[PDB]
Amino acid sequence: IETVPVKLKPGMDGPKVKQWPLTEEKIKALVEICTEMEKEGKISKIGPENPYNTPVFAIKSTKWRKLVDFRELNKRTQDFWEVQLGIPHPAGLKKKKSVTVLDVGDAYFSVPLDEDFRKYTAFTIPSINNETPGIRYQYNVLPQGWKGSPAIFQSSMTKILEPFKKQNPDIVIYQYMDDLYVGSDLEIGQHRTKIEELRQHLLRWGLTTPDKYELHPDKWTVQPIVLPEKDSWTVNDIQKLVGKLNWASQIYPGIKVRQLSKLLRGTKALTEVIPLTEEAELELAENREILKEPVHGVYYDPSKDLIAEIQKQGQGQWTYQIYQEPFKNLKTGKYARMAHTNDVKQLTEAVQKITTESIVIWGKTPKFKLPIQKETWETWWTEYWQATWIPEWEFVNTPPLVKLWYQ
Amino acid sequence: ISPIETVPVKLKPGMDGPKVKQWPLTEEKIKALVEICTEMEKEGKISKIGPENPYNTPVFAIKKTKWRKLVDFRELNKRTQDFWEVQLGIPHPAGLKKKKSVTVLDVGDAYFSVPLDEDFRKYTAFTIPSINNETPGIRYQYNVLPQGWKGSPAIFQSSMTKILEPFAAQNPDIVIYQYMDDLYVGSDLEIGQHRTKIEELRQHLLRWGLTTPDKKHQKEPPFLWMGYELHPDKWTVQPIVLPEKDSWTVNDIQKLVGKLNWASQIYPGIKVRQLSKLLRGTKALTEVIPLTEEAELELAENREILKEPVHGVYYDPSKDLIAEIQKQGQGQWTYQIYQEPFKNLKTGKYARMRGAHTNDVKQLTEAVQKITTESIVIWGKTPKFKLPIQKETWETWWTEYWQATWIPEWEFVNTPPLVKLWYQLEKEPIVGAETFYVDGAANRETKLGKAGYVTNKGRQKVVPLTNTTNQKTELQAIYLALQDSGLEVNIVTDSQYALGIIQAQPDKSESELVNQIIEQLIKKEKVYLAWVPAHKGIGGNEQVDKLV
Ligand SMILES: CCC(=O)N(C)CCOc1ccccc1Oc1cc(Cl)cn2cc(C#N)cc12
């Protein structure tokens, strides 16, 4: 079949990212995978006159799967997959009471890739101890991970899916990278059989779907702030309470504490149980209600980038906020793992959970501010990564002054 | 030359070949050039032609008995395409597997033995000048990889790699390593079989046009390679020479801090903390520097370590990989990687030199990270860890630390110094403890300031400060309250800065004030620090900010 021409953003040259060093086990797995892919035509070996590179990883099931980090190449072909062949995002998918995520990435592998473009998909299987130069391939078919693959394949997808869409004019189906997001309102039992219907339809047409993510987007909002609820109160408690309330002022600018501040006019001791005035309790109730409401002026901007910030809370508990401008939260949430756990395993899942929500709600991913040492994350993130996409990220070095502020 | 396939080469987008002009020089040179270009045209490396080719590149001449031809390609290199980078880092001796026998083969004429893509030869054109520019020049061009062209190393390496393929196939027991113009061949074949295999390899390479040395010229162990000594059963660094001088220059401390880091891969315990401190704000390469007294002690202790040689062993994938860590003091750490308890695979050091305030446990973690990265690079796996810290110490710090941190299998080693949490703040305020409302402040212009406190028991102090900053006074306030209080004290401050430093639980710092605060924090039996917004009339605090 004929290949779609792909051009890079004018004045942009191909990716030149370095390949991280890998466990021997992981290297062997990659060599195995790639020796089979070379055999089926999907990739070929390349010479020194190809200077580009894109990192590759191994993740997992009891089977090793290969994962290409196309983040750099995606930015440099954005005109292609976002304006020329951009796939539109349906704002009705966040409302369904059930969304299932089907991996349809194996479709890309039949379609050839534009000849002039293949050079830009080079990658290297690294060797141990720099003993050998590394094994160097490029793709001859559309790759998973690349954002142009589904843009190019969309038309074929629209045809295969049309029959199913007629019989179920209510089911929402959206494509991001190598996954389909399917949201209905059916009862769970019905929704799961609808999902098997679509799985079988896609299979009677050639698209293989791995199977033997059920997300309920009905509870996805900006969680409300929680002022402590106590029978009795002390100098410290009032002090913590005045402090958090003062911080909240930068986000909900209608809170009042003057009455609560006087409650401790003198220089009382920290453990002094102090009762609350009538002019005092006035605010604790006045401010617990201006705070159960939402903010005003908080609108998503699609020309901007999404920012996600995560904070470690203790005892397998993590909290996050998603914004584009400071103190204007589009979304906030709380991930809680459930002994075989570990700090890095939790941060990793949390990132995956936040990214998936972000795709359902806006159709693009956020850039993470990660509370972890850079080198540690670059070492162990692949160990619990189950997704096929990879968000952008950077590492925070300065801690949060008060962790319980967003608790 | 060789019947190797050429790698196709292109010029950078929207560019054309080099048309630089050839300046004249010695007729003595002009002759000795033509004596090279007929012996090279004969051998097929440079065909002669010049009618229509409009490009050119300069050529000079120099001498070592015989003269040598030279071509400044820098202008053509600026227009040739980007190639796959040739190997950046080089293998580490501690990652090699001992082989029964190892041969080193260096191919001569490497680049000239490899053909150059035809459609790209025209851009290598040069010209031997006439006498007094009264005659036309001798027009030439290359058919092989020119010396010092952007493309020559990477293409050579990939051609060698392809030429080796038919032989690595019939010999899947020999280990060949490539490095620039050399080959390093190893095997556990009995020495009579090996020597035969070596001669087969040479004959193979020779059919492809690559000359090589005979045993009558083949090097023998030990091997002097990239500043190492490679022995049959051990490796070490080539001998290190630390100069003695009485005037030390900035350039010369760099050169010395170099050799010291180099030796640290095998000589355990090298320190470079105080000697590097010297070159902090250094620009002038010649500016002379006084050896600080502490630096001189270090240099002497380094000389002592280098007195006697030490060696490292090679790797045996059959045995486990162990790493041990010790603290050296002053934010300095040292580690050794080994499989057996009397010989190390290698050694090294980690120094924070990043973040004024830090603590022992955070540092240990960063160190383990460093070792984990290096282990993967060298051996392809991570090592079991022997660490001077107790599970309870670590579990306490990582459960409460704001970042995520991961540490692999690790066992405790009870070898002092131990790593400990030296104090901890209370999670809730103390009862029966005086409450100090500290504050502090300075003036930017005057640089004169003050810090004080006011307690619930009615006690009050204010101390005057010269040469200070709002940050320094804010910490000064806390130090006052720790000085003037019992073994249990509640402090209340309006400064996130000071709250930030203390909550980080440092055990050492690059500021003397924080060190005296740490001393008090260890002395006390219960300290609860606590924070309120400033200028909010919270009470207690509204009364202390006024005093200051
Ligand atoms: C028993 C061990 C012994 O004598 N050496 C030097 C280490 C074994 O290492 C090799 C293994 C297989 C091919 C070659 C090997 O040697 C070298 C390996 C490397 Cl990676 C670089 N080399 C450089 C030289 C020189 N000169 C020799 C070697």
Report the 10 Å Cβ neighbour count for A126.
22
Same-domain pairing of B57 and B148: yes
Same-domain pairing of A177 and A208: yes
**B537 interfaces chain A, CB cutoff of 8 Å:** yes
How far from A44 is each of A277, B264, B504, CA to CA, in Å?
Answer: 78, 43, 52
How far from A190 is each of A98, A168, A171, A195, CA to CA, in Å?
Answer: 11, 12, 12, 9
CA dist., res. B333 & res. B367, Å (int): 8
CA dist., res. A397 & res. A30, Å (int): 34
Range 149-178 of A in CB contact (< 8 A) with B? none
Separation of B102 CA from ligand 1 center, angstroms? Answer: 6
Tell me, using a 6 A CB cutoff, whether residue B230 lines ligand 1. yes
Same-domain pairing of A147 and A9: yes
Tell me, using a 6 A CB cutoff, whether residue B188 lines ligand 1. no
Q: Exposed/middle/buried for A47, CB within 10 Å: 0-12, 13-18, 19+?
A: middle
Same-domain pairing of A15 and A150: yes
Same-domain pairing of A149 and A178: no
Query: Is residue B42 a contact partner of residue B184, using CB atoms and an 8 Å limit?
Result: no
For residue A82, the number of C-alpha atoms closer than 13 Å in the C-beta half-sphere is: 12
Q: How far is A21 from chain B (nearest CA, A)?
A: 6
Question: Secondary structure of chain A: what % helix, strand, coil (to 5)?
Answer: 35, 20, 45
Query: Is residue B127 a contact partner of residue B113, using CB atoms and an 8 Å limit?
Result: no
Q: Which of B192, B221, B250 is the last residue of a domain?
A: B221
CA dist., res. A97 & res. A76, Å (int): 36
Same-domain pairing of A21 and A129: yes
Q: Tokens for B190?
A: 């009995």
CA dist., res. A56 & res. A26, Å (int): 10
Query: Is residue B429 a contact partner of residue B456, using CB atoms and an 8 Å limit?
Result: no
Tell me, using a 6 A CB cutoff, whether residue B166 lines ligand 1. no
CA dist., res. B351 & res. B257, Å (int): 14
CATH code of the domain containing A122? 3.10.10.10
Q: Tokens for A373?
A: 């040492």
CA dist., res. A356 & res. A347, Å (int): 14
Same-domain pairing of A22 and A152: yes
Same-domain pairing of B231 and B215: no
**A262 interfaces chain B, CB cutoff of 8 Å:** yes
CATH code of the domain containing B309? 3.30.70.270
Q: Are strands B228-230 and B223-225 parallel, antiparallel or unpaired?
A: antiparallel
Q: Going by CA atoms, what residue is nearest to atom 10 of ligand 1?
A: B186
Q: Tokens for A145?
A: 């991970």
CA dist., res. A165 & res. A180, Å (int): 13
The domain tally of chain A equals 4
CA dist., res. A250 & res. B365, Å (int): 36
Q: Exposed/middle/buried for A329, CB within 10 Å: 0-12, 13-18, 19+?
A: buried
Range 307-346 of A in CB contact (< 8 A) with B? 311-312, 314, 342-344, 346
Same-domain pairing of B135 and B16: yes
Q: Is the peptide bond before A400 cis (omega within 30 degrees of 0)?
A: no
CATH code of the domain containing A178? 3.30.70.270
Whether A49 sits inside 8 A of B81 (CB atoms) is: yes
Q: How far is A288 from chain B (nearest CA, A)?
A: 20
Query: Is residue B104 a contact partner of residue B218, using CB atoms and an 8 Å limit?
Result: yes
For residue A335, the number of C-alpha atoms closer than 13 Å in the C-beta half-sphere is: 21
Residues with Cβ within 8 Å of B182's Cβ and at least 6 positions away in sequence, in order, are B104, B105, B106, B107
Residues with Cβ within 8 Å of A268's Cβ and at least 6 positions away in sequence, in order, are A235, A274, B435, B456, B539, B540
Same-domain pairing of B295 and B441: no
Q: Tokens for B346?
A: 């290698």
Tell me, using a 6 A CB cutoff, whether residue B175 lines ligand 1. yes
Residues with Cβ within 8 Å of A220's Cβ and at least 6 positions away in sequence, in order, are A94, A331, A333, A357, A360, A361
SS (H, E, C) A293-325: CCCCCCCCCCCCCCEEEEEECCCCEEEEEEECC
Question: What b-and-e string marks burial along B332-353, b requiring 16 or more CB atoms within 10 Å of the CB?
Answer: bbbbbbbbeeeebbbbbbbbee
Cα torsion B498, B499, B505, B509 to 10°: value is -10
Chain A residues within an 8 Å CB radius of B86: 133
Alpha-carbon torsion A218, A219, A220, A224, what sign?
positive
Chain B residues within an 8 Å CB radius of A376: 369, 404-406
Give bridge partners of residue B466 from the DSSP assignment: B448
Q: Which amino acid is at B511?
A: S
Alpha-carbon torsion B372, B375, B377, B382, what sign?
negative
Q: Exposed/middle/buried for A401, CB within 10 Å: 0-12, 13-18, 19+?
A: middle
> What resolution, expressed in A, was reported for this entry?
2.6
3 state DSSP class of B66: coil
DSSP letter string, B135-179: S--EEEEESB--TT-TTHHHHHHHHHHHHHHHHHHH-TTSEEEEE
Query: Is residue B77 a contact partner of residue A44, using CB atoms and an 8 Å limit?
Result: no
Same-domain pairing of A11 and A153: yes
Whether B157 sits inside 8 A of A403 (CB atoms) is: no
**B192 interfaces chain A, CB cutoff of 8 Å:** no
Whether B402 sits inside 8 A of A400 (CB atoms) is: yes
Question: Secondary structure of chain B: what % helix, strand, coil (to 5)?
Answer: 35, 25, 45
- The position carrying tokens 């070792």 is B371
Angle at A63 between CA A58 and CA A65, to 5 degrees: 35
Same-domain pairing of B255 and B308: yes
The radius of gyration computed from the CA coordinates of chain B, to the nearest angstrom, equals 34
Domain holding A362, by residue range, is 301-406
Whether B492 sits inside 8 A of A23 (CB atoms) is: no
Same-domain pairing of A110 and A202: yes
CA dist., res. B241 & res. B302, Å (int): 12
CA dist., res. B273 & res. A4, Å (int): 59
Same-domain pairing of B143 and B28: yes
Q: Which residue of B has its CA nearest to A234?
A: B429
Question: What b-and-e string marks burial along B92-110, b requiring 16 or more CB atoms within 10 Å of the CB?
Answer: bbbbbeebebbbbbbbeeb
Same-domain pairing of A329 and A361: yes
Distance of CA B491 to the CA centre of its chain: 45
The domain tally of chain B equals 5
3 state DSSP class of A394: strand
Q: Which amino acid is at A194?
A: K
**Total residues belonging to chain A:** 407
Closest C-alpha among B233, B76, B214 to residue B141: B76
CA dist., res. A143 & res. A149, Å (int): 6
Tell me, using a 6 A CB cutoff, whether residue B221 lines ligand 1. yes
Long-range contacts of A347-353 (CB under 8 A, 24+ apart): A347/A310, A347/A312, A347/A318, A347/A371, A347/A372, A347/B404, A348/A381, A348/A383, A348/A384, A348/A385, A349/A384, A350/A310, A350/A318, A350/A320, A351/A310, A351/A391, A351/A393, A352/A385, A352/A386, A352/A387
CATH code of the domain containing B476? 3.30.420.10
Q: Which residue of B has its CA nearest to A247?
A: B533
Question: Is B545 part of any known ligand binding site?
Answer: yes
Q: Exposed/middle/buried for A225, CB within 10 Å: 0-12, 13-18, 19+?
A: buried
Tell me, using a 6 A CB cutoff, whether residue B98 lines ligand 1. yes
Same-domain pairing of B143 and B99: no
How far from B72 is each of A17, B18, B48, B148, B471, CA to CA, in Å?
Answer: 31, 11, 19, 8, 58
- The position carrying tokens 């796939």 is A87
Query: Is residue B270 a contact partner of residue B305, using CB atoms and an 8 Å limit?
Result: yes
Whether A375 sits inside 8 A of B83 (CB atoms) is: no
Whether A49 sits inside 8 A of B91 (CB atoms) is: no
CA dist., res. A215 & res. A97, Å (int): 8
Q: Which of B221, B248, B263 is the last residue of a domain?
A: B221
3 state DSSP class of B424: coil
Same-domain pairing of B21 and B129: yes
Tell me which of B90, B96, B100 to substitute to probe ligand 1's pocket, judged by most ligand atoms within 8 Å of the beta carbon. B96
Experiment type:
X-ray
Range 289-308 of A in CB contact (< 8 A) with B? none
**Total residues belonging to chain B:** 548
Tell me, using a 6 A CB cutoff, whether residue B99 lines ligand 1. yes
Q: Which residue of A has its CA nearest to B82?
A: A51
For residue B441, the number of C-alpha atoms closer than 13 Å in the C-beta half-sphere is: 11
Across the interface, of A128, A267, A371, the residue whose CB is closest to B456 is: A267
Whether A129 sits inside 8 A of B378 (CB atoms) is: yes
- DSSP label of B59: E
Same-domain pairing of B354 and B369: yes
Query: Is residue B363 a contact partner of residue B356, using CB atoms and an 8 Å limit?
Result: no
CA dist., res. B548 & res. B545, Å (int): 5
Query: Which run of H or E residues covers position A282?
Result: helix A278-289
Query: Is residue B312 a contact partner of residue B236, using CB atoms and an 8 Å limit?
Result: yes
Q: Are strands B127-128 and A98-103 parallel, antiparallel or unpaired?
A: unpaired
Closest C-alpha among B69, B75, B62, B50 to residue B126: B50
CA dist., res. B330 & res. B363, Å (int): 11
DSSP letter string, B221-282: SSEEETTEEE-SS-EEEPPP-----SSEEHHHHHHHHHHHHHHHTTSTT---HHHHHHTSS-
SS (H, E, C) B351-390: ECCCCCCECHHHHHHHHHHHHHHHHHHHHCCCCEEEECEC
Closest C-alpha among B135, B139, B155 to residue B147: B155
CA dist., res. B383 & res. A21, Å (int): 15
**B180 interfaces chain A, CB cutoff of 8 Å:** no
Cα torsion B190, B194, B196, B201 to 10°: value is 160
Q: Which residue of B has its CA nearest to A28?
A: B380
Q: Which of B315, B333, B360 is the last residue of a domain?
A: B315
Same-domain pairing of B227 and B199: no
Separation of B516 CA from ligand 1 center, angstroms? Answer: 54
Chain breaks of chain B after residues with C–N above 2.5 Å: 64
Write out the E strands in B266-355. Answer: 288-289, 322-329, 332-340, 343-351
Whether B369 sits inside 8 A of A373 (CB atoms) is: yes
How far from B393 is each of A404, B35, B386, B419, CA to CA, in Å?
Answer: 24, 77, 15, 8
Alpha-carbon torsion B95, B99, B101, B104, what sign?
negative
Domain holding B77, by residue range, is 1-86+112-152
3 state DSSP class of A72: helix
3 state DSSP class of A280: helix
Binding-site residues of A for Mg(2+): 103, 178-179
Q: Tokens for A265?
A: 């006019």
Range 263-292 of B in CB contact (< 8 A) with A? none
Could you tell me how many CB contacts below 8 A there are between chain A and chain B?
A: 183
Q: How far is A231 from chain B (nearest CA, A)?
A: 17
Angle at B118 between CA B114 and CA B124, to 5 degrees: 80
Report the 10 Å Cβ neighbour count for A297.
6
Chain A residues within an 8 Å CB radius of B490: 269-270
Q: Which of A241, A266, A300 is the last residue of a domain?
A: A300
Same-domain pairing of A173 and A208: yes
Query: Is residue A299 a contact partner of residue A317, using CB atoms and an 8 Å limit?
Result: no
Q: How far is A238 from chain B (nearest CA, A)?
A: 9
Same-domain pairing of A152 and A164: no
Q: Which amino acid is at A371?
A: P
Q: Are strands B288-289 and B322-329 parallel, antiparallel or unpaired?
A: unpaired
Same-domain pairing of A255 and A386: no
CA dist., res. A241 & res. A284, Å (int): 9
How far from A320 is each of A169, A366, B309, CA to CA, in Å?
Answer: 35, 12, 55
Chain A residues within an 8 Å CB radius of B454: 267
Tell me, using a 6 A CB cutoff, whether residue B186 lines ligand 1. yes
Chain B residues within an 8 Å CB radius of A269: 434-435, 456, 490
Same-domain pairing of B288 and B141: no
**A11 interfaces chain B, CB cutoff of 8 Å:** no
Query: Is residue B142 a contact partner of residue B120, using CB atoms and an 8 Å limit?
Result: no
Q: Tokens for A36?
A: 């089979």
Closest C-alpha among B25, B28, B59 to residue B140: B59
Same-domain pairing of B390 and B416: yes
Query: Is residue B456 a contact partner of residue B485, using CB atoms and an 8 Å limit?
Result: no
Query: Is residue A360 a contact partner of residue A217, using CB atoms and an 8 Å limit?
Result: yes
